[PDB]
Design a binder for this molecule. Structure first.
Ligand code: COB
Length: 510
């Protein structure tokens, strides 16, 4: 329509493409030049280039590759770097054909102006990321604030033309399933629309592929393509894409289109989760939606509760729990029986490669809602028997166990200070000094997490501590915690939350 979109080929990027990385390391010139020509045939108008890698001499790599790209391509190169010397080198070999990638305010005005001056001086296009000193702009209001500040500086101090600018309000993944990043696509799109109006004549660019990160190939292609189009509609001029894997909107089935939008704009309904629905669309072995729903509703009460956790079925949960409390079913039994049995099954399915990670998250969300609704119906016996600082150790994220321990001990008269997850030993002991607890609990599921526990106890030993530490987790074995007593004589293994209770009871003298 208004003008075609300037496509930038993403593939020559050490951070992004594993294939390019390995090609670069191996010094596969023919491989790289093939990959460049290929992207242009597939419809790219320019090529992003990033050779920066942890432990590699950026400048060396560029000195090698650039002379070749120079002669072997007609199209422009977008140089993706934080080193000005690198940008200079690129500007040397490819005069007139360069767009400079990062220019931003993360480390203040110093870095920003250095890059901008180059752009001005070598008459190169400039990309401007919406990142300031407080970090990445995640909302529109932020993305706009930052852009405008930058625009002022670029146009007045450097005298760059609007036309010479490309604003990258950022592209975040919305596919990992965490609640916090549901609207980060939407907020970018809103900013773009507002800035197109307030800053006429500037360009906009996005690294489109990111929005979809870690979905199946086919799903990415759709989500990428719909995002690209919606950004275009709101003023996008350039796009860092895989040119060969963007579908025109006319070729995307109506359902997939709508699901992609549902996800991008976070159009939550009552009984719908956009992300999971979008994922589900691409899965094969699709039953009659009505047939599946009927098969489910036909299950026994306990078996249906289980399947709610596995299939991640939030809606009608409180209904079913209400029903089970009406029959002779006790809260703790519903958890330690059908609900946790579901959680085990999720484990096995994820382990077999039969379930993707966000579905596991949604399973956990059903479990948490379930326990939230059941917590008032559990017995609340005793009060103020003692205190427990409880936490998941460095680099461990699983916490359904931890939280059950919280609930059960809290219900049996213990004060539980739950420090949440990934808690370093420093922070744990800070809270120990604060709350003066009778014991410390450390959760962690994976093997590596047990070695952290060992380190944690070494640390605690060395700073004089002797209060009881209760360790729990899958990979933990009682035999192993017995050995740890050589480091810290007051460690205890806990198989389950009830053992935690039993230990706390013995330790406080009940
Ligand atoms: C009650 C609780 C229910 N179960 C659960 O919480 C979930 C079990 C499940 C299915 C795992 C398989 C399984 N069958 O266990 C699995 N995940 Co998960 C896919 N996971 C998740 C889920 C958790 C969500 C949450 N908010 O907690 C997440 C998506 C976040 C998840 C994430 C990961 N997961 C991952 C993996 C690999 C595994 N995950 C496992 C643990 C498992 C075994 C499954 C697998 N499939 O292979 C993998 C680990 C193998 C191993 N190392 O040995 C990984 C790396 C996946 C990824 N590639 O990103 C990632 C971990 C990142 C990291 N550590 O940073 C889940 C759901 C699982 O059991 P529990 O053992 O925690 O508690 C139990 C409890 C009950 O009474 O008391 C005990 N206890 C535990 N701690 C303490 C105590 C008791 C006391 C008294 C204490 C003071 C502390 C005792 O250990």
């Amino acid at each position: 329509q208004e003008a075609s979109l300037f496509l930038v080929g993403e593939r020559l990027n050490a951070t992004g493409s594993k294939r390019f990385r390995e090609m670069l390391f191996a010094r596969d010139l023919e491989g790289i030049l093939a990959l460049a020509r290929e992207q242009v045939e597939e419809g790219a108008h320019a090529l992003d280039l990033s050779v920066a890698w942890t432990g590699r001499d950026e400048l060396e790599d560029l000195r090698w590759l650039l002379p070749h790209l120079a002669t072997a391509l007609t199209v422009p190169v977008m140089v993706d770097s934080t080193s000005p010397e690198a940008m200079e080198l690129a500007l040397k070999y490819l005069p007139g054909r360069v767009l400079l990638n990062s220019a931003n305010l993360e480390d203040g005005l110093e870095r920003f102006d250095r890059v901008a001056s180059l752009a001005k001086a070598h008459g190169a296009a400039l990309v401007v990321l919406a990142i300031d000193e407080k970090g990445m702009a995640k909302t529109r209001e932020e993305k706009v604030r930052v852009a405008l500040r930058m625009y002022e500086r670029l146009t007045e101090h450097h005298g760059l033309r609007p036309e010479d600018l490309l604003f990258d309000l950022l592209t975040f993944p919305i596919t990992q399933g965490d609640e916090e990043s549901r609207p980060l696509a939407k907020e970018t799109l809103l900013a773009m629309e507002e800035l197109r109006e307030r800053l006429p004549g500037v360009g906009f660019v996005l690294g489109v592929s990111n929005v979809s990160f870690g979905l199946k190939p086919r799903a990415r292609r759709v989500l990428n393509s719909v995002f690209l189009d919606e950004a275009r509609k709101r003023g996008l001029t350039a796009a860092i894409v895989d040119a060969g894997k963007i579908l025109p909107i006319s070729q995307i089935p109506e359902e997939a289109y709508a699901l992609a939008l549902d996800l991008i704009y976070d159009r939550r309904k009552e009984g719908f989760d956009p992300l999971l629905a979008f994922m589900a669309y691409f899965e094969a072995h699709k039953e009659d939606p009505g047939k599946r729903e009927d098969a489910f509703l036909a299950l026994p009460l306990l078996e249906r509760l289980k399947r709610r956790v596995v299939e991640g079925r939030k809606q009608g949960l409180e209904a079913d729990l209400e029903e089970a409390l009406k029959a002779g079913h006790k809260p703790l039994d519903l958890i330690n029986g059908p609900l946790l049995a579901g959680m085990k099954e999720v484990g096995d399915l994820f382990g077999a490669g039969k379930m993707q990670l966000p579905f596991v998250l949604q399973a956990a969300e059903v479990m948490k809602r379930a326990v939230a609704y059941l917590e008032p119906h559990m017995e609340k016996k005793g009060e103020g028997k003692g205190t427990l600082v409880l936490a998941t150790v460095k680099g461990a994220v699983h916490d359904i166990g931890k939280n059950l321990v919280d609930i059960i001990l809290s219900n049996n008269g213990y004060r539980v200070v739950n420090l949440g997850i990934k808690v370093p030993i420093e922070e744990i002991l800070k809270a120990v000094e604060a709350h003066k607890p009778h014991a410390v609990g450390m959760s962690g599921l994976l093997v590596k997490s047990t070695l952290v526990m060992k380190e944690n106890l070494e640390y605690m030993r060395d700073r004089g501590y002797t209060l009881p530490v209760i360790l729990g987790g899958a990979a933990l074995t009682r035999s192993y915690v017995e050995e740890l007593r050589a480091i810290y004589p007051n460690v205890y293994y806990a198989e389950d939350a009830f053992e935690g209770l039993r230990l706390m009871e013995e330790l406080t003298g009940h």
